[PDB]
Symmetry: D2
Subunit: 387 residues, 4 copies
């Protein structure tokens, strides 16, 4: 009955189930949650662990004594439940000081503060056992063209990530970074707007091996992109260090629906890919229970995230294992796609008259791809309609 257990590696941000329901036009609809209660309730639902922004776990401006008490209580809840903390991150977007960015703020003093705030929380993340440190630069960008010279901003962004890499290397930490793209919101345009832009940026860092991406379903979908395709490119690059799962209904404000909502067929193809590729990282949900809901609805929404993942996992596995689907994949030449174009080499290709001079383009053109039959087998599997 699609019941999650910790072995499924499902994780949730404190800020997800703890979202009080403030949106772009309305006040909170739910009380704040104590992180300890979220840990306990998520454990009861079969979660593996939780994640946090610094400021979710320790109220901004806490004294050292307050900070230690907040961490102590949280660690007791983790120990009580067996929950893990595989990932943490920094809040460089809520406080008004970050209104023009953290690492790419025009104000140099703000950039320095952003780095210090991040470094403090990296230490805590390591203490709590996190393997991955996410950076979502939600305030990095602009509403107008003159406000942000993007080459200068990318110089500053590279400088910041390089310094963080220097820091973790200097401390002997094993933690790695995962940069999270988003195309817009809260800035009119955000820097590193997609998986591609973040992958490209990482290749200019001094120690690129320390950085990957943390793609979020809804974020790539806010640019109308195909999330499974972007995940495939991240996997191809060896850079899928973490992932955020949720739902999004098209190009509009960031909805953060529970996973499986939004584009359900995209959710199916995503799970198919993660499972086929043997992705071994957390299945992390960055979602918002809608502000229509009370706390019972919060936990229902969270449970539904995990349930939908497990249903889609079953259906994708059944699809790939079905001999009729395997025959259809051959009919559509997916096997040929996985074979080298010219393992014979360039000169052999140039000398091969079957590749040009004597290639029957019309016969090749006439061969149907049989993709519709393949896709209706996929639909039948997804819907449990084989027959």
């Amino acid at each position: 009955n699609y019941q999650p257990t910790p072995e499924d590696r499902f994780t949730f941000g404190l800020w997800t189930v703890g979202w009080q329901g403030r949106d772009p036009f309305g006040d909170a609809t739910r009380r704040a949650l104590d992180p300890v209660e979220s840990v306990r309730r998520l454990a009861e639902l079969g979660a593996h662990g939780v994640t946090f922004h610094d400021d979710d776990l320790i109220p901004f401006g806490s004294s050292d004594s307050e900070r230690e008490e907040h961490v102590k209580r949280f660690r007791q809840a983790l120990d009580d439940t067996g929950m893990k903390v595989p990932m943490a991150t920094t809040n460089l977007f809520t406080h008004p000081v970050f209104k023009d960015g953290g690492f790419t703020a025009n104000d140099r003093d703000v950039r320095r503060y952003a780095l210090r705030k991040t470094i403090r929380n990296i230490d805590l993340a390591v203490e709590l056992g996190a393997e991955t440190y996410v950076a979502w630069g939600g305030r990095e960008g602009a509403e107008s063209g003159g406000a942000k010279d993007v080459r200068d901003a990318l110089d500053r962004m590279k400088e910041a990530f390089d310094l963080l890499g220097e820091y973790v290397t200097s401390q002997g930490y094993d933690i790695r970074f995962a940069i999270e793209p988003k195309p817009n919101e809260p800035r009119g345009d955000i820097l590193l707007p997609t998986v591609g832009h973040a992958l490209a940026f990482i290749e200019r860092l001094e120690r690129p091996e320390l950085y990957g991406v943390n793609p979020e379903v809804g974020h790539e979908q806010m640019a109308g992109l195909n999330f499974p395709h972007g995940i495939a490119q991240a996997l191809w690059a060896g850079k899928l260090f973490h992932i955020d799962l949720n739902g999004q209904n098209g190009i509009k404000y960031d909805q953060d629906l529970r996973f499986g909502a939004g584009d359900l067929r995209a959710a199916f193809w995503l799970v198919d890919l993660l499972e086929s590729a043997g992705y071994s990282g957390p299945r992390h949900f960055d979602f918002k229970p809608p502000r229509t809901e009370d706390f019972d609805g919060v936990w229902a929404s969270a449970a539904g995230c995990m349930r939908n993942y497990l249903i889609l996992k079953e259906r994708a596995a059944a699809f790939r294992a079905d001999p009729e689907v395997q025959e259809a994949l051959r009919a559509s030449r997916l096997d040929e796609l996985a074979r080298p174009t010219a393992a014979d080499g360039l000169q052999a290709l140039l000398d091969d008259r079957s590749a040009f001079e004597e290639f029957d383009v019309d016969a090749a053109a006439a061969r149907g791809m049989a993709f519709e039959r393949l896709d209706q087998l996929a639909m039948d599997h997804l819907l449990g309609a084989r027959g």
Copy 2:
């Protein structure tokens, strides 16, 4: 009066002014143009040169004798006019054989044919003096999830680009490649959908120095992305080898409006950036005179491409040179954005109490960015409304 001359490096594809006006629901509205007439008419408008797909210049399936005559006539028109050919490309999308791709077709024989067709035209491009060879893989992608394993497809795409790099190196050619992203159309989703994805992909090629991007205004805008931002990242990476200029009104079918149409403020910020950065490549238009137009409207539309570039160049230069704008840029701390965050180094940053322990976050937060005043100065400059 914003009159273009060849020194402005404006170029046009044969397929642009030669577009007969077939769209997704209608037949041609204009006769085919002889490339020779397009060269002559573009030269008369002040163009610098022209570009071509193989199949624009030599009808598909031409005999060797026909091919030589087509090239001979074209070269006579170039010589007659002083027009150059700075870029050429391959048509790997029109012929039905490419219905599932060229370099990433599931059928291996089609992939081999795509490479042979490309190599043949690289030789011709070099003969005609082209410095850049564009590849727009418009058929690389999918309408459905099972049809295309994207990791396998990227393996094939890398194999193809690596072989082309091997080929140009083997012939001692100086030509470089420019990969053109597009998010969708004609495929439901296209591989390397944005500037970021193409930049990232290039970093996995064997000889990455031989490849850059050929971004198109409308294509990034079809993903709702900020084209000037993407161009800034391409410049930051040193990969803006070529550019396609046109207009697009938002997220919808690829309109290919004349440059300046569509998002006019984005056109202003693009020209500002290209000129500020000293981009030295062709200002190439990949546009379609709308099918409402007759041939007089074709040449009016082409002229308007160049006129709009020159108006925006004047206004951007005036903006940047205006002492009041320079003061506003300082007021908004664009100067600070261009200064290193921590040239003092990591340890100095960690030891700097002004960066954290004694940082007055509220005072920093209270400092307005003054971006609206800056942007209204930009608006006033664009519209010729200073005062």
Copy 3:
């Protein structure tokens, strides 16, 4: 096994399965189909009937003798198979004469021709038994602001529809009109871009009772709108005279995927609504088998349209019939939504202190809507995962 029969009222345009695969960048991939063969093959798949544009059935420019032979052969195929023709329409978009519109062309002579062409085909539609006459004004609109005064264009559009209403009334025909909205493509913006705009326009016609809408799934989705919501408003207005079913993956070019592809949850909620409302019209597919496919894939794609409708019908019916869902609907106050706000009347409402002075807004605010539990029951039903 979700097998369609004619009693299901599934219909297809000749132009759908007959699409030769010309798209915005490529040549045909399939031969033209004889309408007679399409009728026979669709009947074999369990279709109820077919629809046509004038020019699909009778080649443009046919002599009277040719026209009679084309119609005679078609009527023999209908008689041979038991297929019906519930709807027909006019092609006012392919021929270059319609490059600026039919009914709202700037050229008056073109507007008059568009009306004559339409009237000729209304007569034929009636002859063949059609109850509904669709008008999709794909060329009505503009790429630029000065080209089309939209108030004048709406005057001309109203004049045209009024004349068609006068014509059918004058002939005693029972046929009604269904106006099909689309937001863009092939024009940069199309007039009457959504279901709302078409409904509003109908209310200004002289005989509004003769006109409804023909909404298409993909078209409303090209504006990022919720298709089930638009269908509900059309039903609410009593104007759902016909519908086009297909799939669309977001805001981009008009894909015309087979029904069930694209937004699958939107397809589920659409079928739920059509069945709940007792929509009695044709379940018509306006789709394109992708140009990757050969003719076997054409018929597979067509079959899949009908199969997906029948699967979703089963799952929606199961959802609505499930006592646990009925309890959840009460928990979410869907029953209360269907009860009048103030059947007691305005004065009673003003005098009701429980509605304001003594309304406990905080207690009301605290009541969760329980929408996530309801939606996960819907997801479970769709996926066949109850348990």
Copy 4:
């Protein structure tokens, strides 16, 4: 120098310049403004007046004594400055009680409360001299399909608007209603998502003459629609009772940029249309000074709204008055578009062989529309580049 005066009828919501800068991921960046200070500062900039939600002027939950003092101070500021209040509206979206809607909340008691809250503020609006009462039902809609039966919701929405019409008629008030569409945000989909849907809905109300639309630039643009086209349809229907002016960069979250920002050419064509049509209502700005700004930037942003309107007004007037543009409009047959298609009547059209039998479709098709020359004249006028 494009200086606004009250005669220009520029108005601003209290909530616009008073926006404290809370967005979907961040805390306030500016202190709350006293409405009295906003009235004074807007008057100094040349504004004509201000608008308000009930809860902007009187803090939610105010005692009668507090309410009277808030109104008294506001009326003194209006009297001190000569500012008017042409429009008011209700906040049916901020308070958590409205989390599932006001007029279409599933909870009947909430619907009744929404009406009482609205009626109370209609009385105040009339007291303060407002001619128009706006309703933006930002919470009316859904995130999931089962949560909202849209036919039932439209029944409730009609009931609510009918009761408000009954109320204003019963009091002898001259005020009229303006319904504001928005496609999404804060709900996943909002009911009456576009100008078309709102126009259509109004035609089912008991007293349709009392209701028009209040279209907002950014809202129609969030559906990728052409705002000038939608305004033309509203004008055509005689329903443009009020308008909200601002900017939006494409399909994404509601940006509420200052007017002129976003789609600048759409702003030009909008002003051209409002001025050509003789729209006589307020030029109201519903905008947000970006949260990057301090209060000096708030007033700069507000000033820029009015400045951009006045620049575009000048350029549109110059365009329409230019004899070369008038010649181009004739060349493009805009004059013919404004002439009846068939004032001769249906029978004359049927009998006119020049309309069909003897219509030279090829000669008509060959006639270019000359739209590109016309549009480049428009561009030249907008940019002050004639020559």
